[PDB]
Amino acid sequence: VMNRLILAMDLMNRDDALRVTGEVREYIDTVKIGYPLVLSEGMDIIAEFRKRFGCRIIAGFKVADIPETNEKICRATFKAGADAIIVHGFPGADSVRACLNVAEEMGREVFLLTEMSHPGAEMFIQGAADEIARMGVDLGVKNYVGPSTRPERLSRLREIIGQDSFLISPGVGAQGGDPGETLRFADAIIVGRSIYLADNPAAAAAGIIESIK
Amino acid sequence: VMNRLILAMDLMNRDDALRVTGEVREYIDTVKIGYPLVLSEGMDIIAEFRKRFGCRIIAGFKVADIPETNEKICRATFKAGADAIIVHGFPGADSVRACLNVAEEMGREVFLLTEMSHPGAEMFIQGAADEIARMGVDLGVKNYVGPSTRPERLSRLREIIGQDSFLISPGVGAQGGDPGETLRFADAIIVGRSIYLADNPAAAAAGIIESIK
Ligand SMILES: O=c1ccn([C@@H]2O[C@H](COP(=O)(O)O)[C@@H](O)[C@H]2O)c(=O)[nH]1
Ligand SMILES: O=c1ccn([C@@H]2O[C@H](COP(=O)(O)O)[C@@H](O)[C@H]2O)c(=O)[nH]1
Ligand SMILES: [Cl-]
Ligand SMILES: [Cl-]
């Protein structure tokens, strides 16, 4: 990932989303598109981003359904052009495998979300996170998502998945996570609001990159 | 809910989804639309269903993001016409409250998904399900989703939420759940494939209703 920086484009209208992404295109080559934008503008927005920016697209859908439905969601998502999809690990191994099956068939990637970055994650997710990470390792998952907001937890996750695995981390900026500290364990950071809500997105992205040069 | 039967419309193309729903419209007044259909045809499909069938629409999105993103997803979904949205409880209380806030503002409903119906749910969700249910009760949640595939678990969930709460349950038919047994605890059953994949959807729906009379 270019500059170890992934833009979380959660604006909800195409003009703004495309405008802001364009303002920071020189600093990134990977964009995470989620439901706020997709539900507001349609799945065709993914193809629009790929054609306009020639960027990698990670669908931050955090799939969390039964196996059969997970397969359908992944199929629809990859057909739309997504290079990868983020899947929740809490629902179990069968639900994860369903996503892996479609990813293998279509030559795409799966990112396993272990622990989440928000406060509520401490209630149920945190206690299962280490086991969810191990589950991913046992199934050969190579891409993971961990919390920037809890460096020691992110560090433990890194220990479990190993140095070879790819780890990205949200929660940098708006949620309180620090770019540099997070990159001690993650290969790339996910940044949304700190950039897309900034007075000048380009300066914001440049500032982040400057602090981690 | 008419006939205590909610149709899970997970077909992935407009023509088929509308045709099948039309075939069983005389037996239902509530349809659950999820990502397989919405990602394939766009969120406008929700409005299409409401105007063509005058039915209640439950968005089976199982929202499972951080609070801020959950708010955006719920807002986009309710603006699209959804009467209710299904929210995952495992991400915690703040993520649930975010959904409740938007539902309150827009005069819509939130259904809290406690334990899931597939095998993988036993790995992490099951052990947290009773507490997730209690969390919902403590926050005043009145609508819940529990597994048809585990009658005793569904029964325990009913005990926790009380007779007052509304409980719907997926996993009937394709996943092995029995309509009658499930309705001993749930107010309504969610049925997808057993109906929409049937040679004769209308006959399939009638058959289910027959054994429930
Ligand atoms: O544990 C997680 C999983 C997903 N995200 C997502 O990552 C982005 C973080 O954006 P922001 O807080 O930098 O604005 C959003 O798209 C959000 O939905 C998190 O924040 N935390
Ligand atoms: O625990 C859960 C939560 C959601 N669903 C959803 O309920 C429907 C069940 O459909 P079917 O198995 O009758 O086809 C699908 O939309 C599915 O995604 C489950 O099956 N189990
Ligand atoms: Cl995400
Ligand atoms: Cl659902």
Half-sphere exposure of A38 (CA within 13 A, CB side): 24
Closest by CA position to A207, among listed A187, A180, A176, A171 = A180
Query: Is the CB of B177 within 6 Å of ligand 2?
Result: no
| Rounded-to-integer distance, Cα A191 and Cα A205, Å | 9
CA distance A92 to chain B (A): 4
| Rounded-to-integer distance, Cα B151 and Cα B159, Å | 12
| Rounded-to-integer distance, Cα B56 and Cα B61, Å | 15
Asked if residue A85 lies in contact with residue A111, where contact means CB atoms within 8 angstroms, the answer is yes
**Distance in Å, CA A59 to ligand 1 centroid:** 12
Q: A16 at the B interface (CB within 8 A)? A: no
| Rounded-to-integer distance, Cα B182 and Cα B146, Å | 10
CB–CB of A124 and B90 under 8 A?
Answer: yes
The three-state (H, E, C) secondary structure of chain B, written as one string: CHHHEEEEECCCCHHHHHHHHHHCCCCCCEEEECHHHHHHHCCHHHHHHHHHHCCEEEEEEEECCCHHHHHHHHHHHHHCCCCEEEEECCCCHHHHHHHHHHHHHHCCEEEEECCCCCHHHHCCHHHHHHHHHHHHHHCCCCEEECCCCCHHHHHHHHHHHCCCCEEEECCECCCCECHHHHCCCCCEEEECHHHHCCCCHHHHHHHHHHCCC
Nearest ligand 2 atom to alpha carbon B116: 1
| Rounded-to-integer distance, Cα A9 and Cα A81, Å | 16
Closest by CA position to B11, among listed A158, A37, A76, A42 = A76
Helix (H, G, I), strand (E, B) or coil at A191: strand
Identify the sign of the CA torsion B73, B76, B82, B84: positive
DSSP 8-state class, residue A29:
S
| Rounded-to-integer distance, Cα B187 and Cα A169, Å | 41
**Ligand in closest contact with the CA of B111:** 4
**How many C-beta atoms surround the C-beta of residue A83 within 10 A?**
16
**How many C-beta atoms surround the C-beta of residue A152 within 10 A?**
8
What method did the depositors use to determine the structure?
Answer: X-ray
**Distance in Å, CA B187 to ligand 3 centroid:** 34
| Rounded-to-integer distance, Cα A100 and Cα A105, Å | 9
**How many C-beta atoms surround the C-beta of residue B140 within 10 A?**
7
- H or E stretch at A61: strand A56-63
| Rounded-to-integer distance, Cα A114 and Cα A111, Å | 9
Q: What angle do CA B59, B201, B112 make, to 5 degrees?
A: 25
Helix (H, G, I), strand (E, B) or coil at A155: helix
- At what resolution in Å was this solved? 1.5
Q: B117 at the A interface (CB within 8 A)? A: yes
C-alpha B43, offset from chain centre: 17
Nearest ligand 1 atom to alpha carbon A193: 14
Rounding to the nearest 10 degrees, give the CA dihedral for residues A42, A44, A48, A49: 70
Could you tell me the CATH number of the domain that includes residue B28?
3.20.20.70
Chain A residue with minimum CA distance to B121: A91
Amino acid code (one letter) for B79: K
Q: How many domains does chain A have?
A: 1
Query: Is the CB of B174 within 6 Å of ligand 2?
Result: yes
Domain ranges, residue A16: 1-213
* Phi, psi (rounded to 5 degrees) for A173: 95, -105
Helix (H, G, I), strand (E, B) or coil at A190: strand
| Rounded-to-integer distance, Cα B118 and Cα B126, Å | 11
> Which tokens sit at A44?
């065709």
| Rounded-to-integer distance, Cα B13 and Cα B20, Å | 11
Amino acid code (one letter) for A117: S
| Rounded-to-integer distance, Cα B185 and Cα B171, Å | 14
Angle at which helix A67-79 crosses helix A93-106, to 10 degrees, equals 30
**Distance in Å, CA A153 to ligand 4 centroid:** 30
Asked if residue A100 lies in contact with residue A75, where contact means CB atoms within 8 angstroms, the answer is no
Kindly report the length of chain A: 213
Cα distance from N-terminal residue to C-terminal residue, chain A: 14
Q: A88 at the B interface (CB within 8 A)? A: yes
Helix (H, G, I), strand (E, B) or coil at A146: coil
Q: Which residues of A are catalytic?
A: 62
Which of B80-98 are b and which e, b meaning 16 or more Cβ less than 10 Å from the residue's Cβ?
bbbbbbbbbbbbbbbbbbb
